RNA sequence: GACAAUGGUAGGAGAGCGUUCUAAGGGCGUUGAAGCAUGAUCGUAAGGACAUGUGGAGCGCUUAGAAGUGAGAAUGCCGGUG
RNA sequence: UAACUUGGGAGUCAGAACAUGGGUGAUAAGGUCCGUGUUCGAAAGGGAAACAGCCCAGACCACCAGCUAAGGUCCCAAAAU
RNA sequence: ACCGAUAGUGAACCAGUACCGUGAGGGAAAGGUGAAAAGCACCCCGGAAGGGGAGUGAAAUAGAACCUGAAACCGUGUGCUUACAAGUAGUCAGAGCCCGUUAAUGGGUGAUGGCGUGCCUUUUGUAGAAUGAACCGGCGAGUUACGAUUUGAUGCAAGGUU
């Protein structure tokens, strides 16, 4: 292990889900929130209970 | 003398000294291939195959074995956020006819 | 670190315009209009790669029917006869025959009438 | 009184055919041969019209 | 951000009547000189491994050097005054590569200075011994004392 | 051979210059001078000075005889603008553009 | 690929003559339309006028089945309002039968550029004679 | 090799292209970098190279890390031109 | 050749026609409310001139190959005057 | 492992200026010649601006908002085509004319023919006469901290961990 040959173990690291970056991702344009509801808003939600 | 030969799922009309283009074949780039599903024979001596002419054939010489022009498959469905883009180079095999029968 | 969106918009858009080369007016100079007409070209070609087959089949059919009518037959009775006889040459090769030399087509016809 | 659609370069140019101006009613002055002038008008240079200075 | 950006407060134009968009402040992100939406904020990235895992890292690194033959034990260093020319002559007489890590029991000012100005060469003292250091190195030169001190720690 | 002369930052607008250049393009030089000197448009003096400059510096620098010359390409390119404001009613402004031109005139002997 | 396409300098547009003494116009005009488009040639190629010419003769002697000559009607319209004109097929057979056959065949041809060209290859005469023997035509029967 | 599956919205899962910076390594560059423009180029896709003109000084490549990480729409904002 | 159990993540709570058994209505509505099934939604293609919902049928890609479905075979417009 | 002139300070420049408002107050735009000024002696056109040659310079195709210099936009020249034709403007087929490539089933144009009602949003459902966008370019939207939960990884294991 030199600094030009680095490699983690398998499946330790995993790439962040970026959201609202085109429709080909399955999380573009609504970002996994659907259409037009209280849950579809910034801060949108209720108390947990 | 022309002939009609069943190859690549389809039929082709040939002449001695004709350059054709067929599907990919398990064959190399300068070797010889032989067509055995001859269906028809033309010229002065016409003879019909039912389905094929018995034992008649066509020998031919391979020249190139390569990949065709690159069509772009793009499909599109409107106001539903759905597209594909998928490319395709369909292979071929170029032959140069030598003899009929 | 900051990211200026340099070079990538312009590349991706130029590529689309050069696909739109040859189109009318602003469809070869703008990006939005060219993009959307390029998508139309894609779907249209997807279906034309199918239409093409049907078209040429109808063409082969029409020519063969004309030749059979010259030989006092119809397409239907012709292809039935060839089927019964057993010969498996297609419409394309039949058209090419009927065009290039009439003798061999007449011979096919007599074979079919024998079939019937 | 308000257009719904922009006027393409094609229509703009098809309309701007007849807007041009023409070659004027030009001729030579025979007092000086060259120095072309307007017909039925005085020559600015020669001050002439049918031979006579003006 | 939207809030720290020297302006705003004024509603630039009215909510209705104009054929202009809804707007609430001239410093919103959609604007030109507007505030930024999330962006970065000051942070630390330092995190933590357990003691046993970090000691393992040291052992693994040194084992890698010793398997790669980048380990060379010298009796000692004795520099009555610092001299880089003399230290590089030493490194030549020991036939070392360019980029190498050097270890002592203690500071050893004279040798630290005699190698302070060489770019490929780095110095540490067996309690300042780092994975980054001994992996940014093709060889490792250590004294007998420091070797035993590492041995008895680990 | 070729000679040119140019005039940059001209106050007249190109749509109003090109009308005249369409009368000069591809004609004898004296003919073209007369066209400009007899047309009552206001760009025609300016075009004339560009032209006579071309004939002058052809006769001078490149050494061509003024007689054999014709106007090979005479073109006008958009220059800058000067953006101005004409107050229309009810507090509304309306923009004005004092457009510019780059009158170029290129002269040849036919070879 | 291995298909022929027809071309100018590969077409022989022939002339035919078709008499219509005791014949019905639909069962004539279909054949004539096939002739005009080129449906009866092996070199049929749809982007070309591969077809032959036709000369319809004794069109004043044309036959109608049933009471069409009093109940079949040729409506048309001038783009002014109330611009309806109507003519019974019989009265048009009396006045201008050439037009009658022409329109019957042109409704049986396509309505494109090429199709109109193909319609221009038609010639109709209510009489029994014609000028167009300069190009040595031929009789056709069905 | 045999056999099968492969329409798809909200949406869930996975494998990836690219951008800016950084560590290490190996490298290119005034005999001409990036950038721009042109092309009939490769890849299953995002996208990558090669040439030529311009240009005149920085830039890739491998592995890994971190993000101000990708725009066609918000009566979006700023500028430019119609 | 599916099912169930545990746990992570969701979205959905505006539905529509057709056919059918029924209510309401006027044994009216492309009406409305329910049960059953299909299609669309989320499904292109072929027929019905055109026409989400009707009939046939479910597109990985290519092919100037062949058999068929509904529907059709005088011409437009492939194929039986 | 901060920006790099639409960023970063509202302000890289004579900026809390210019401008707006009675007033409190609000509040901009605007960077780059070249190594060096060696910053175009001189002749010609022109009233001048501006330009063409000459000469400085490696370079003026670096000549004063003077590094590079995209797109929209405006034009000039020309190869193929177009004045009986009903067009989401294309795609598939296709002669003819013109040229000659990252030389491989070549490029441009396109007589004519078949098929074919834009994108987004929102909708049971939109060609829609429902919404939005004049075009072009830049800018512009799931992030960070602190805890919790589950999954993956690794370390020690009835111990682990600060
Ligand atoms: K379904
Ligand atoms: Mg989805
Ligand atoms: Mg979108
Ligand atoms: Mg929404
Ligand atoms: Mg809702
Ligand atoms: Mg919701
Ligand atoms: Mg679609
Ligand atoms: Mg951007
Ligand atoms: Mg505030
Ligand atoms: Mg307030
Ligand atoms: Mg408005
Ligand atoms: Mg800011
Ligand atoms: Mg006022
Ligand atoms: Mg499928
Ligand atoms: Mg799928
Ligand atoms: Mg997901
Ligand atoms: Mg962003
Ligand atoms: Mg209702
Ligand atoms: Mg829905
Ligand atoms: Mg069949
Ligand atoms: Mg038919
Ligand atoms: Mg600023
Ligand atoms: Mg800049
Ligand atoms: Mg410049
Ligand atoms: Mg014409
Ligand atoms: Mg119509
Ligand atoms: Mg077409
Ligand atoms: Mg609209
Ligand atoms: Mg925009
Ligand atoms: Zn005079």
């Amino acid at each position: 292990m030199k600094l030009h040959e680095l490699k983690p173990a398998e499946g330790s690291r995993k790439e962040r889900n970026r959201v609202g970056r085109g429709v080909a991702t399955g999380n573009g344009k609504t970002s996994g929130r659907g259409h037009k509801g209280q849950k579809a808003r910034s801060g949108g939600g209720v108390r947990p209970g | 003398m022309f002939a009609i030969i069943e190859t690549g799922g389809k039929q082709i009309k040939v002449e001695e000294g004709q350059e054709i283009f067929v599907e990919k074949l398990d064959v190399n780039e300068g070797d010889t291939f032989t067509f055995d599903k001859v269906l028809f024979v033309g010229g002065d001596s016409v003879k019909v195959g039912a389905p094929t002419v018995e034992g008649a054939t066509v020998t031919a010489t391979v020249n190139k074995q390569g990949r065709g022009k690159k069509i772009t498959v793009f499909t599109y469905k409107r106001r539903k956020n759905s597209k594909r883009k998928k490319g395709h180079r369909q292979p071929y095999t170029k032959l140069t006819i030598d003899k009929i029968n | 670190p900051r990211v200026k969106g340099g070079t990538v918009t312009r590349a991706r858009r130029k590529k689309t315009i050069k696909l739109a080369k040859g189109y009318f007016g602003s469809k070869h100079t703008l990006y939005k209009v060219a993009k959307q007409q390029v998508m139309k070209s894609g779907q249209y070609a997807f279906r034309d790669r199918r239409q093409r087959k049907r078209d040429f089949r109808k063409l082969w059919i029409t020519r063969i029917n004309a030749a059979a009518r010259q030989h006092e037959m119809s397409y239907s009775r012709l292809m039935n006869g060839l089927k019964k006889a057993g010969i498996d040459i297609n419409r394309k090769m039949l058209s090419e025959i009927a065009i290039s030399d009439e003798k061999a087509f007449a011979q096919l016809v007599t074979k079919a009438k024998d079939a019937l | 009184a308000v257009p719904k659609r922009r006027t393409s370069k094609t229509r703009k140019n098809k309309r701007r055919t007849h807007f041009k101006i023409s070659v004027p009613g030009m001729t030579e002055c025979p007092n000086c041969g060259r120095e072309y002038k307007l017909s039925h008008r005085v020559c600015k240079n020669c001050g002439s019209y049918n031979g006579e200075e003006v | 951000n939207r809030s720290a950006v020297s302006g705003g407060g004024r509603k630039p134009w009215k909510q209705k009547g104009t054929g202009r968009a809804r707007q609430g402040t001239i410093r919103a992100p959609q604007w030109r000189g507007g505030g930024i939406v999330f962006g970065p904020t000051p942070r630390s990235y330092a995190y933590k491994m357990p003691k046993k895992m970090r000691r393992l890292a040291l052992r693994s690194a040194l084992s890698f050097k010793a398997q790669e033959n980048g380990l060379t034990v010298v009796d000692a260093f004795n520099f009555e005054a610092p001299k880089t020319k003399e230290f590089k002559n030493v490194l030549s007489t020991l036939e070392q590569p360019k980029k190498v890590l050097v270890v002592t029991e203690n500071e050893d000012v004279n040798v630290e200075l005699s190698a302070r100005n060489i770019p490929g060469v780095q110095v540490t003292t067996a309690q300042g011994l780092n994975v980054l250091d001994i992996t940014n190195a093709d060889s490792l030169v250590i004294t007998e004392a420091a070797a035993k001190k590492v041995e008895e720690v680990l | 051979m070729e000679a040119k002369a140019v005039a940059r930052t001209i106050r007249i607008a190109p749509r109003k210059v090109r009308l005249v250049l369409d009368l000069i393009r591809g004609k004898n030089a004296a003919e073209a001078i007369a066209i400009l000197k007899l047309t009552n448009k206001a760009s025609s003096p300016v075009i004339e000075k560009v032209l006579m400059s071309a004939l002058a510096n052809a006769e001078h620098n490149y050494d061509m005889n003024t007689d054999e010359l014709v106007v090979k390409e005479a073109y006008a390119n958009e220059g800058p603008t000067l953006k101005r404001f004409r107050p229309r009613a009810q507090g509304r402004a309306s923009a004005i553009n004092k457009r510019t031109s780059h009158i170029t005139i290129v002269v040849s002997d036919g070879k | 690929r291995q298909t022929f396409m027809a071309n100018e300098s590969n077409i022989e547009r022939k002339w035919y003559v078709i008499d219509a003494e005791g014949q019905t116009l639909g069962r004539l005009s279909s054949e004539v339309a096939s002739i005009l488009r080129g449906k009866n040639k092996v070199t049929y190629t749809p982007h070309v006028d591969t077809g032959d010419y036709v000369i319809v003769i004794n069109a004043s002697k044309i036959e109608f089945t049933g009471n069409k000559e009093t109940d079949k009607v040729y409506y048309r319209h001038s783009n002014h309002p109330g611009g309806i004109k109507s003519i019974t097929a019989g009265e048009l057979r009396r006045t201008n039968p050439e037009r009658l056959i022409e329109n019957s065949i042109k409704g049986m041809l396509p309505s494109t550029r090429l199709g109109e060209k193909q319609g221009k290859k038609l010639f109709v005469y209510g009489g029994a004679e014609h000028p167009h023997a300069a190009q040595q035509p031929e009789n056709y029967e069905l």
Side-chain angles (χ1 to χ4, degrees), chain G residues 1 3 26-27 30 33 37 39 108 110:
Chain G
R1 194 173 162 72
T3 297
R27 295 176 182 265
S30 301
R37 296 175 77 249
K39 279 282 293 299
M108 292 168 62

Side-chain angles (χ1 to χ4, degrees), chain G:
Chain G
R1 194 173 162 72
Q2 300 297 106
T3 297
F4 182 80
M5 283 291 169
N7 302 322
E8 292 296 336
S9 298
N10 286 115
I11 296 303
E12 298 294 328
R13 292 176 182 80
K14 186 179 286 188
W15 286 76
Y16 287 116
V17 176
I18 291 170
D19 188 358
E21 188 178 0
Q23 186 64 247
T24 67
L25 70 163
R27 295 176 182 265
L28 191 148
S29 62
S30 301
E31 291 290 328
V32 174
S34 65
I35 294 164
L36 289 168
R37 296 175 77 249
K39 279 282 293 299
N40 292 328
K41 293 181 178 181
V42 292
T43 58
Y44 179 75
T45 309
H47 66 86
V48 179
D49 190 2
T50 62
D52 295 337
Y53 294 88
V54 182
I55 296 160
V56 177
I57 289 163
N58 287 314
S60 68
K61 289 180 184 180
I62 200 69
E63 178 174 358
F64 294 161
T65 55
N67 57 13
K68 289 174 182 171
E69 65 190 2
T70 62
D71 282 330
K72 181 174 173 72
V73 176
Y74 284 133
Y75 293 104
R76 71 192 172 85
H77 185 83
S78 66
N79 297 114
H80 297 74
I84 285 290
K85 274 76 177 173
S86 66
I87 306 161
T88 57
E91 191 173 2
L92 190 60
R93 185 175 62 192
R94 291 182 187 268
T95 57
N96 190 3
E98 302 185 359
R99 180 174 297 175
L100 191 143
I101 298 294
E102 285 178 353
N103 289 317
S104 177
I105 292 164
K106 287 178 179 180
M108 292 168 62
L109 289 164
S111 296
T112 57
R113 299 188 185 194
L114 191 73
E116 291 170 351
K117 288 173 187 292
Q118 293 162 357
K120 292 174 190 175
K121 294 194 290 183
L122 179 71
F123 297 103
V124 189
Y125 297 100
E129 294 177 351
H130 62 83
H132 303 289
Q135 47 268 6
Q136 56 179 4
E138 289 183 354
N139 283 314
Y140 181 89
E141 284 178 350
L142 194 146

Side-chain angles (χ1 to χ4, degrees), chain E residues 29-104:
Chain E
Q30 57 174 353
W31 287 77
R32 180 258 183 82
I36 300 296
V37 178
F38 295 114
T41 50
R43 275 187 277 167
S44 68
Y45 297 84
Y47 64 93
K48 283 173 188 171
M49 294 199 296
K51 294 180 185 172
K52 292 179 187 177
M53 296 173 72
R54 67 186 81 166
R55 295 174 72 182
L56 198 162
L58 285 165
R59 293 197 291 262
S60 62
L62 295 170
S63 70
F64 182 76
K65 304 295 282 178
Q67 286 286 328
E68 290 277 325
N69 292 324
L71 185 64
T72 292
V73 181
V74 300
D75 188 79
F77 294 96
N78 291 317
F79 287 86
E80 289 82 2
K83 193 72 189 288
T84 69
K85 181 166 175 282
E86 292 172 355
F87 186 74
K88 190 178 180 182
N89 292 125
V90 172
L91 290 170
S92 64
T93 54
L94 302 185
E95 302 168 355
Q96 294 292 316
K98 178 65 175 183
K99 187 172 257 71
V100 55
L101 190 276
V102 172
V103 176
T104 62

Side-chain angles (χ1 to χ4, degrees), chain A residues 29-30 34-36 41:
Chain A
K29 182 181 164 280
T30 60
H35 304 290
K36 289 172 71 177
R41 308 297 183 190

